Amino acid sequence: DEANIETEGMVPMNRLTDDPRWLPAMSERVTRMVQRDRNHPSVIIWSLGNESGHGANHDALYRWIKSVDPSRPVQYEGGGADTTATDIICPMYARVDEDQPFPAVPKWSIKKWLSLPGETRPLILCEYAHAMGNSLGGFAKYWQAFRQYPRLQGGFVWDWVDQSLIKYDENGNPWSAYGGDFGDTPNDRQFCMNGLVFADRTPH
Amino acid sequence: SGIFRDVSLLHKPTTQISDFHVATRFNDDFSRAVLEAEVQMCGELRDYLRVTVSLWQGETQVASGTAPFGGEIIDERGGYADRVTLRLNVENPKLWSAEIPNLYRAVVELHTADGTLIEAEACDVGFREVRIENGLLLLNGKPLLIRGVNRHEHHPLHGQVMDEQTMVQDILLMKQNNFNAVRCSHYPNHPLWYTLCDRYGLYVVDEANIETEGMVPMNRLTDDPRWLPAMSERVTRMVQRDRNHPSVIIWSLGNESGHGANHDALYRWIKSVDPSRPVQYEGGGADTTATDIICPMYARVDEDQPFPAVPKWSIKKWLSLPGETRPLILCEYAHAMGNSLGGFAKYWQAFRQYPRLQGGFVWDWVDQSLIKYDENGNPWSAYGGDFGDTPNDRQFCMNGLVFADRTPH
Ligand code: NA
Ligand code: NA
Ligand code: NA
Numbered sequence A: 001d002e003a004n005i006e007t008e009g010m011v012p013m014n015r016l017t018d019d020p021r022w023l024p025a026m027s028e029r030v031t032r033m034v035q036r037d038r039n040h041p042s043v044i045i046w047s048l049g050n051e052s053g054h055g056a057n058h059d060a061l062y063r064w065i066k067s068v069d070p071s072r073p074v075q076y077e078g079g080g081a082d083t084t085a086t087d088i089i090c091p092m093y094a095r096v097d098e099d100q101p102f103p104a105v106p107k108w109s110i111k112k113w114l115s116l117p118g119e120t121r122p123l124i125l126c127e128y129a130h131a132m133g134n135s136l137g138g139f140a141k142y143w144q145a146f147r148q149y150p151r152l153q154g155g156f157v158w159d160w161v162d163q164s165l166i167k168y169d170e171n172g173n174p175w176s177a178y179g180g181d182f183g184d185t186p187n188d189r190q191f192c193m194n195g196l197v198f199a200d201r202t203p204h
Numbered sequence B: 001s002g003i004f005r006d007v008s009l010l011h012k013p014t015t016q017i018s019d020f021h022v023a024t025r026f027n028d029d030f031s032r033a034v035l036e037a038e039v040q041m042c043g044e045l046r047d048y049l050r051v052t053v054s055l056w057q058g059e060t061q062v063a064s065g066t067a068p069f070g071g072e073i074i075d076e077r078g079g080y081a082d083r084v085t086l087r088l089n090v091e092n093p094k095l096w097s098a099e100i101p102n103l104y105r106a107v108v109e110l111h112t113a114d115g116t117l118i119e120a121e122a123c124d125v126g127f128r129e130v131r132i133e134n135g136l137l138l139l140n141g142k143p144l145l146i147r148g149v150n151r152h153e154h155h156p157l158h159g160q161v162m163d164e165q166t167m168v169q170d171i172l173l174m175k176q177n178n179f180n181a182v183r184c185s186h187y188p189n190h191p192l193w194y195t196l197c198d199r200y201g202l203y204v205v206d207e208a209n210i211e212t213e214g215m216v217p218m219n220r221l222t223d224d225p226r227w228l229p230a231m232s233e234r235v236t237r238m239v240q241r242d243r244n245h246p247s248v249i250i251w252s253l254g255n256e257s258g259h260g261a262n263h264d265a266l267y268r269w270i271k272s273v274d275p276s277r278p279v280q281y282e283g284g285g286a287d288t289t290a291t292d293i294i295c296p297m298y299a300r301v302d303e304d305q306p307f308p309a310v311p312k313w314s315i316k317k318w319l320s321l322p323g324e325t326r327p328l329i330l331c332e333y334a335h336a337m338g339n340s341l342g343g344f345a346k347y348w349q350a351f352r353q354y355p356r357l358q359g360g361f362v363w364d365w366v367d368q369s370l371i372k373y374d375e376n377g378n379p380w381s382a383y384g385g386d387f388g389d390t391p392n393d394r395q396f397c398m399n400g401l402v403f404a405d406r407t408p409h
């Protein structure tokens, strides 16, 4: 279950999340979420949001949840996926054997990530295997490592369904539209379609 | 068998230096050190006795200090009237490493306050700290990358007799081939070996002469308290003899003798007596409570070998097992028997990518072939069974990177 906070478009990404003046608004997104959903058993992990960098507001909210509901781990990928705000190392798009050492927020091979000096947490990718159009190449690689390494505990594929929208041609025939097709601009074109299934739920 | 190492005769005065330990401790950035030398005497104590410890860098005296015997109060009964600890400050020491084996000379003098010398002892001192921290083996604060090799004491002609030429030769080749470390598989070496490693610069793993592999199960003797004593002398006597050599950076409790309670005890003994160096031991599974370092033998890179009780996990996977945090250095890997070393680069790639994979000691340095003469007196390389020996292990005694004569494979 993930709080509704994502501030990716900021520069740097934690501009807001590191600012105390935004702590009240973030706080509600998190606390109201826990208050509503805490009795659901299918909820096994709480998430602080998505792509919001790593700011002190995150630390605070991580702690709050931990105090209020110790029954579930808290994860958060922002800022490098292994910050003090997550109980699970939860990278997005980290590869199996290949390192991607971006400065500040590298994406280590997941097998290597696990045994970095002092690291002891489990690793579950919050996002992996970008199913955008003809894809899913290398998927078996992930599975093979998840099975061999105890602390490699899987991940969540990005993602389920293509966000394509229906449009109609002059003749009243429908077709799938994506970014820009609505005269929307700037836009990110086909980037909204990354699902394992078509919008109508037909599989890829 | 035989008297295969040097025999010598030593004359000591009646009042003498019976033991001395040298320790070097540093500040946070290694820019200041303290040299601590604990000195013990035997014979008659007198108030006029003194110990002077001086430290030299080449021909320059760095520091010196004197005191009469009488150590600090240890307990309710007091202190050791027959010991004394001198502490010397060293500013900006030149650090020892296998990359640059800077050494100082410590001179230990026993003498009278009027200035007559009774006797002097001494040793080469290398300023360096060995410690495991946060999962890594560090030397002077930096994480080691061990390019090691196992090396038995073997001469095609002299058998187990080691000479200085041979030792030098080995060392030079090793260095010339990018090795920076050696494991004394599986017993303490001839004393000069250490001295050379000190001076030429190679990291050494000193190992107790304890191997009981042919027992069933392997820890049969090692878990038996009746054997603790015998084992104890093999570990304690090694440490007492080799502890002032900077080249020794790790102690090993022996080789392939399972994991017994005797191991745990000895492991602790050493930790207690010489905290300066980590203790490792591969027996019983390579990650028991008797080792500070995961040190498997022949564990593969990506492939697990899940034998019962003592599985050999892929080393990459080993590091991250639940709860594991230690560094991993293979005590033996890449069995170089005959036309071998296939897949060697796969270990190196792993070593470089994973911080806690700190290398390993290839098995091993030189083939253990012996020379024989044919009917015409022509020499030939013999192996297991060639002397009429039976049963035997045939060519398994030839696993080195070099032929018994030192020619490279
Ligand atoms: Na797993
Ligand atoms: Na997308
Ligand atoms: Na490494």
Ligand code: NA
Pocket (backbone or CB within 6 Å): B396, B397, B398, B399
């Ligand atoms: Na062998």
